[PDB]
Design a binder for this molecule. Structure first.
Ligand code: MG
Ligand code: ZN
Ligand code: ZN
Ligand code: ZN
Ligand code: ZN
Lengths: 76, 334, 98, 134, 75, 183, 129, 42, 152, 215
């Protein structure tokens, strides 16, 4: 695995190790743990950015939209 | 000359799902419908041999039609005529306005315009099949056209000839390359036998620089058959044997070369001299053995094909009788 | 009725296409451009009247069908009117190893 | 369909008999195999304008009657619809390399009846359009 | 630290002549491209759009080919 | 230097530039496939494929000037006549039928040579696939199995019924799927 | 004498700051055609792109299939649907779509179009139904 | 009011009726395709 | 658009066709359930263009583009004179994309703030408060069965 | 036939010389007449070979109607050369760095053989070079003066000797520049100064001048 991809999963690894700690998963069966891990994998896959996204235009819109509100408080 | 060629093209597929289920066959059918019998990329393309390489059927991206295109790399049989090519069957379709049109009836569909300013022309009429030699102007293959375009004239024995001085020896690879033209000459000589002897004799007498004694002396047939006419001076050499034992490294091509009018313009005969005994009015062309051998072999191929096509088009005496001016001007310029 | 710059930005931010295509070509001045692919200049192609020619290199004409808009053709003509030569390289043909 | 028939009195049987006649005629037309079906397809599928006149003459071979401008033409080998008279004039003008305005003026004999388009009086096909004159 | 003005575009995408013409100052960009014999690869959004084409992103980022084997074996 | 058109210049010698081109240039030209045999032969002579230019022109070398770039330079007048005659013959040969055949065969052979040189599911997952096999006959979830069964989970997400991963259910919403398909 | 339709003279002020030898051969000048590419398909075990279709890829597959069913219509689907869009969506969901997804990873200078070919019938589908 | 011989370009789908002396009279309801004010050139 | 003639035919000239042929192209009216692209200028957000299911208003006296007030957050719109552009995709690819990629359900979560865009606005917020409050000035906030049913 | 599907991958920008105009021109403008009745006059600026903008005639060049015709450029053989309006500054830069007698560069090419290519000519023209002596023909480089009355006229100032640099004289000067000088000054071989003077301008297709720009 490339190093940057390992760092990309650091936050999710942290969250999984916190919420799936042994103290927190005492009333969960092994098959239930498999289902939980499969659901986590599915949700992580569903959250990835699509290939060919115009993310630059998305960022331009998302940063230019607050600019009119920043103007609206120019007298403040 | 008829030859193979490899082309690159992009087709258009209006039914990509139906175009599949048989890709090679549909591809071949589309290539035949598009490129067969049409000038394309400095050649004519007579038939599609097959597809060498091809692309996946990509779906068109810049429109909402759903069609595919696919890239095709196919080998095709093409005809590339050149200057001084001899076409023995040209049918004149126009004679007014001093343009003198024509149309080759051979395997290579070239439409040949013939100059009218020259006093030699203006003797053929509409519907008159007569041989034509292409001028030194390069054939004009307009892409997508159903025939080639060239300028030619009524063929004349053309007593002017060239002398080739050879200072570079043949190599093994060059001789192997010349073996292809040697094989072409061999098939031409093989096909020379099928044509009836009297017609080939009459035509060869017609298109000869000098005069031969009423087409009865000797039995010129080449394809071995060691005969010879005129014999103005010196001994011919068999170019086929010279190229065959050239592969065997038993000879040297260094010297002077020429194919004078006294030689039979069809025979595999040439002079390998060392003193330029020929009385041509031009300096020897210093070149390599490959250049001279290629030039001589192409001349032999052109003349052999010329004779074969002449025998093919005029297969009876009715056509010979019909041409009321073709056969006597050629005998006039002797 | 105009679909301006910002509408195109929104449509391409959604990654749409096929709607930029529909509106900007099929419901607009969208046309077909022909390029020789050997010189890159606009070629002359006509199916009905048999015309497959290139005013540049003549026997080397290999006309490709390129989806375009009349606005872009006019824009390139205007650039060439100011003595700026516009040459379209065209995507190379890709072949699967047989 | 029922309520349409009770609220129609002998004409009610004419409606549902003509309906069956048209349905069978249309099924026959869908299953029709006159030799023109490839010929009319070739005529409209854009080919060289020299070949188009030859194909249009080939269609004229199967003409049942010389219809200047009255109604459709029928496949002589099958009796079904063959070619509208406007298509003959239109193909004539295409081979003549006539202009769009010339075609619109000449085709202003099949004009029926903002659309901006003229439609055939016989087959209801788009003859030409007139939005603005330049 | 490049800017979001014309200078930043010139520093980041000097070869994208069409994009820089579409942003601002088309006459100077065109003149400099003609003088410098600039080659403009077609990428992004502005350059394909100015050429009458569609950007190769979104639905067009990945191309589609026909599954010839599957079509032959399942007509 | 460079002189304008129709500008009187005084010819003391004539140098032919023996331009050298890589074989990839000839290969690109053959791939384009529409070039005339004269230009094809000229470039092939530029590369080390044919030597017709050097064959025709090295006989009138008379090297007396050098100046970097490789070529032949003729100084004496008779050498100029010989140079011109050899040039005319060379370029007539390059446009001749024989060299046309040779260069077309060479381009063919090179292109042909280049082208011919080119060329077990886990127990829970087993149960889930079994459930989807029954569901495929009644919902558009035609199952396939990969290593991570990611398409399997994606199909269990669109239809709902993600609960089969941890709960026995299966038959609970199988009949619900029957009712939905019937409706 | 009074003209109203003025043209508003246009000014550009920020100048750009972009940062043997013979006449020309038939190689340096010309050859705009660009050399043909060979399709280097990455082996299935060397592929690094996602085994799940993106919404862009799935949408494009459905659109292409439905447009093809508009002109064609020979379908391998079992249940009959009255619209090409529904037919294409069910073909994708039933893993019967006859299309493939090519992801062009890289075009090399040497003339190779390195691509990954993905089969949508063995891929994850993110669409709704 | 133009006539079929006056046509050369008559608008498709237009009415060309309701025109009295080249103008639609006062008090006449006019719809989308109706021709108000008839003018002919040449 | 008849395929056999490769040309467009008026519907008033096709009175003799009975049915339609395979490969024909029919240009039908917009009906309820069709997808349409809704756009308000200036188009500044990723949700400035969205796809809505068409509800055809058969009242001939209505000329406005009607929308739910909770959908206005996508377009930063209000009903005080704002004009919006609506075009119905007619091609198959565009319709597929409209119902698969550009539907407003994809813009419920903001691309900018990563949070929800839509929700209760004005009367709906006050109504939720009034409905969920424990007491009214009239006593306990309760309704009988008839009025509880009328809420749904 | 059968123009295959294609996509534009790159666009090349170049200075269009008169040779390019001659190659690309489908017709040569020779007359001032606009229309011969209801049809364009042949050889005029409205000639149909340039494309059709009216329904009243087809193209001729592509045999298409108005909708399907993209327009085709023509040629006007100028009796006297003209300077390219977009590249007047390039003409000025080239005039100040090469000798107006033999075309040799008056500047030292080795001096600028460390800068980037887009800047070599600018810095070469930045230097004065007035009164410099050519090392080939021993001529004195004049002062290249840009006329303040218009955007194109150039003046040759030889220590007060004032003579107008006509486009014909400029073409004679620019035609003596070698491609070696062009390359060593950071310019492409497609940017030879000989293309900056036009004896055959391109009249644009009628598609971009519909029936004012034709006046
Ligand atoms: Mg408002
Ligand atoms: Zn070209
Ligand atoms: Zn009709
Ligand atoms: Zn045109
Ligand atoms: Zn000097």
């Amino acid at each position: 695995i490339p190093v940057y991809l390992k760092r990309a999963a650091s936050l999710m690894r942290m969250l999984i190790r916190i919420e799936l700690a042994t103290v927190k998963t005492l009333n969960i069966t092994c098959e239930q743990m498999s289902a939980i891990l499969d659901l986590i994998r599915l949700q992580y896959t569903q959250s990835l950015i699509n290939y060919g996204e115009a993310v630059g235009i998305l960022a331009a819109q998302s940063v230019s939209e607050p600019l009119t509100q920043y103007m609206l408080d120019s007298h403040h | 000359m008829i030859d193979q060629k490899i082309f690159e093209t992009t087709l258009n597929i209006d039914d990509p799902t139906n175009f599949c289920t048989n890709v090679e066959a549909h591809l071949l059918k589309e290539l035949e419908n598009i490129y067969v019998g049409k000038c394309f990329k400095n050649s004519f393309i007579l038939n599609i041999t097959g597809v060498i390489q091809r692309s996946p059927c990509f779906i068109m991206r810049t429109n909402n039609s759903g069609r595919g295109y696919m890239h095709v790399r196919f080998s095709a049989v093409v005809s590339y005529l050149n200057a001084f090519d001899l076409i023995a069957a040209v049918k004149i379709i126009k004679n007014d306005s001093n343009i003198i049109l024509g149309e080759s009836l051979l395997t290579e569909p070239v439409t040949i315009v013939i100059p009218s300013s020259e006093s030699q022309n203006n003797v053929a009429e509409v519907g008159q099949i007569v041989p034509v030699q292409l001028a030194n102007s390069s054939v004009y293959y307009i892409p997508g056209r159903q025939q080639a375009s060239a300028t030619g004239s009524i063929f004349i024995p053309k007593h002017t000839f060239s002398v080739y001085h050879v200072q570079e020896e043949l190599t093994q690879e060059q001789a192997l390359n010349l073996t292809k033209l040697v094989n072409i000459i061999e098939m031409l000589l093989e096909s020379r036998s099928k044509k009836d002897f009297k017609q080939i004799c009459f035509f060869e007498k017609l298109y000869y620089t000098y005069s031969i004694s009423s087409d009865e002396i000797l039995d010129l047939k080449i394809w071995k058959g060691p005969k010879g006419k005129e014999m103005s001076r010196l001994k011919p050499c068999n170019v086929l044997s010279f190229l065959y034992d050239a592969l065997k490294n038993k000879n040297s091509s260094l010297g002077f070369w020429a194919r004078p009018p006294n030689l039979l313009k069809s025979s595999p005969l040439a002079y390998q001299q060392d003193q330029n005994s020929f009385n041509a009015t031009e300096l020897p062309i210093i070149c390599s053995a490959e250049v001279m051998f290629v030039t001589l072999l192409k001349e032999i191929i052109n003349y052999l094909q010329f004779i074969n096509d002449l025998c093919d088009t005029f297969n009876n005496e009715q056509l010979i009788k019909r041409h009321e001016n073709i056969w006597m001007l050629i005998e006039q310029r002797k | 009725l105009r679909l301006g710059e910002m509408e195109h930005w929104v449509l391409t931010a959604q990654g749409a296409m096929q709607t930029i295509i529909e509106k900007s070509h099929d419901d607009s001045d969208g046309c077909i451009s022909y390029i020789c692919r050997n010189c890159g200049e606009p070629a002359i192609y006509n199916a009905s009247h048999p015309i497959y020619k290139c005013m540049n290199c003549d026997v080397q004409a290999d006309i490709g069908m390129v989806d375009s808009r009349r606005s872009s053709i006019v824009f390139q003509h205007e650039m060439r009117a100011a003595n700026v030569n516009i040459t379209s390289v065209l995507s190379p043909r890709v072949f699967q190893p047989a | 369909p029922n309520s349409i028939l009770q609220e129609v009195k002998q004409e009610a049987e004419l409606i549902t008999t003509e309906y069956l006649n048209i349905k069978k005629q249309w099924e026959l037309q869908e299953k029709n195999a006159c030799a023109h079906l490839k010929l009319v397809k070739q005529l409209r599928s854009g080919l060289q304008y020299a070949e188009l006149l030859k194909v249009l003459e080939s269609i004229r071979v199967l003409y049942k009657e010389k219809n200047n401008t009255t109604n459709w033409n029928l496949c002589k080998a099958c009796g079904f619809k063959l070619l509208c008279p406007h298509v003959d004039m239109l193909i004539q003008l295409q081979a003549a390399e006539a202009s769009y305005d010339t075609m619109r003026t000449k085709l202003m004999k099949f004009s029926g009846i903002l659309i901006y388009s003229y439609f055939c009086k016989i087959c209801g096909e788009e003859l030409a359009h007139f939005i603005q004159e330049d | 630290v490049t800017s979001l003005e014309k200078a930043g575009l010139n520093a980041r995408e000097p070869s994208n002549v069409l994009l820089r013409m579409a942003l601002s100052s088309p006459v100077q960009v065109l003149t400099d491209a003609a003088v410098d014999s600039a080659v403009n690869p077609i990428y992004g959004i502005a350059a394909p759009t100015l050429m009458g084409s569609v950007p190769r992103i979104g639905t067009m980022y990945s191309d589609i080919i026909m599954d010839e084997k599957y079509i032959t074996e399942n007509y | 230097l460079a002189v304008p058109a129709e500008a009187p210049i005084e010819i003391y010698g004539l140098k032919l530039r023996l331009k050298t081109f890589s074989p990839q240039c000839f290969m690109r030209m053959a791939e384009i496939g529409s070039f005339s045999p004269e230009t094809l032969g000229y470039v092939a002579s530029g590369a080390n494929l044919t030597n017709f230019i050097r064959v025709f022109m090295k006989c009138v070398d008379q090297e007396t000037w050098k100046k970097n770039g490789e070529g032949v330079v003729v100084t004496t007048k008779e050498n100029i006549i010989q140079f011109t005659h050899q040039y005319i013959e060379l370029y007539k040969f390059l446009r001749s039928g024989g060299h046309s055949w040779l260069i077309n065969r060479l381009a063919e052979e090179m292109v042909h040579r280049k082208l011919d040189r080119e060329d077990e599911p886990e127990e829970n997952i087993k149960r889930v696939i079994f459930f989807l096999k029954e569901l495929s006959t009644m919902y558009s979830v035609s199952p396939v199995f990969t290593s991570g069964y990611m398409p399997l989970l994606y199909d269990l997400y669109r239809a709902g019924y993600l609960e089969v991963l941890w709960n026995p259910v299966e038959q609970k919403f199988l009949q619900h799927a029957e009712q939905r398909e019937k409706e | 004498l009074i003209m109203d339709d003025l043209v508003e003279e246009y000014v550009e002020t920020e100048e750009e700051n972009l940062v043997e030898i013979v006449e020309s051969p038939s190689i340096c000048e010309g050859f705009v055609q660009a050399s043909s590419q060979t399709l280097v398909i990455i082996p299935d075990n060397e592929r690094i792109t996602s085994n799940v279709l993106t919404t862009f890829e799935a949408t494009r597959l459905v659109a292409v299939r439905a447009q093809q069913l508009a002109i064609n219509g020979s379908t391998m689907l079992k249940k009959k649907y009255s619209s090409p869009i529904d037919i294409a969506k069910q073909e994708l969901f039933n893993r019967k779509i006859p299309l493939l997804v090519m992801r062009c990873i890289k075009v090399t200078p040497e003339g190779q179009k390195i691509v990954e070919i993905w089969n949508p019938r063995e891929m994850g589908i993110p669409l709704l139904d | 009011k133009p006539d079929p011989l006056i046509t050369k370009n008559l608008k498709p789908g237009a009415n060309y009726e309701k025109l009295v002396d080249g103008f639609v009279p006062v008090g006449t309801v006019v719809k989308k395709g109706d021709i108000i004010i008839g003018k002919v050139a040449k | 658009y008849k395929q056999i003639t490769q040309s467009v035919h008026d519907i008033e000239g096709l009175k003799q066709d009975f049915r339609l042929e395979v490969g024909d192209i029919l240009y039908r009216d917009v009906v309820t359930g069709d997808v349409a692209f809704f756009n308000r200028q200036p188009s500044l957000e990723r949700s400035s263009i969205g796809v809505h299911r068409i509800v055809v208003l058969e009242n001939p006296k209505i000329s406005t583009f009607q929308m739910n007030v909770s959908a206005c957050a996508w377009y930063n719109a209000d009903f005080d004179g704002d004009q919006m552009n609506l075009w119905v995709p007619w091609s198959v690819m565009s319709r597929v994309e409209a119902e698969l990629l550009c539907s407003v359900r994809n813009w419920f979560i903001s691309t900018k703030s990563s949070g929800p865009v839509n929700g209760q606005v004005q009367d709906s917020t006050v109504g939720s408060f009034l409905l969920t409050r424990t007491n009214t000035p009239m006593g306990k906030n309760v309704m009988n069965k008839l009025h509880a049913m009328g809420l749904f | 036939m059968e123009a295959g599907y294609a996509e534009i991958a790159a666009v090349q920008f170049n200075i269009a010389g008169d040779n390019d105009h001659k190659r690309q021109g489908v017709m040569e403008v020779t007359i001032s007449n606009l229309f011969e009745g209801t049809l364009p006059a042949e050889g005029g600026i409205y000639d149909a070979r340039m494309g059709t903008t009216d329904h009243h005639y087809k193209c001729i060049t592509c045999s298409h109607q108005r909708k399907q015709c993209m327009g085709h450029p023509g040629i006007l053989q100028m009796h006297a050369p003209v300077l390219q309006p977009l590249f007047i500054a390039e003409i000025r830069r080239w005039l100040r760095v090469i000798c107006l007698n033999c075309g040799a560069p008056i500047v030292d090419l080795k001096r600028y053989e460390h800068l980037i290519r887009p800047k070599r000519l600018i810095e070469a023209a930045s230097s004065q070079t007035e009164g410099k002596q050519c090392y080939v023909c021993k001529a004195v480089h004049p002062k290249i003066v840009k006329d303040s009355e218009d955007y194109f006229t150039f003046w040759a100032d030889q220590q007060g000797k004032i003579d107008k640099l006509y486009p014909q004289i400029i073409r004679e000067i620019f035609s003596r520049v070698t491609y070696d000088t062009v390359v060593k000054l950071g310019r492409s071989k497609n940017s030879h100064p000989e293309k900056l003077v036009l004896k055959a301008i391109q009249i644009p297709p009628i598609s971009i001048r519909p029936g004012d720009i034709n006046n």
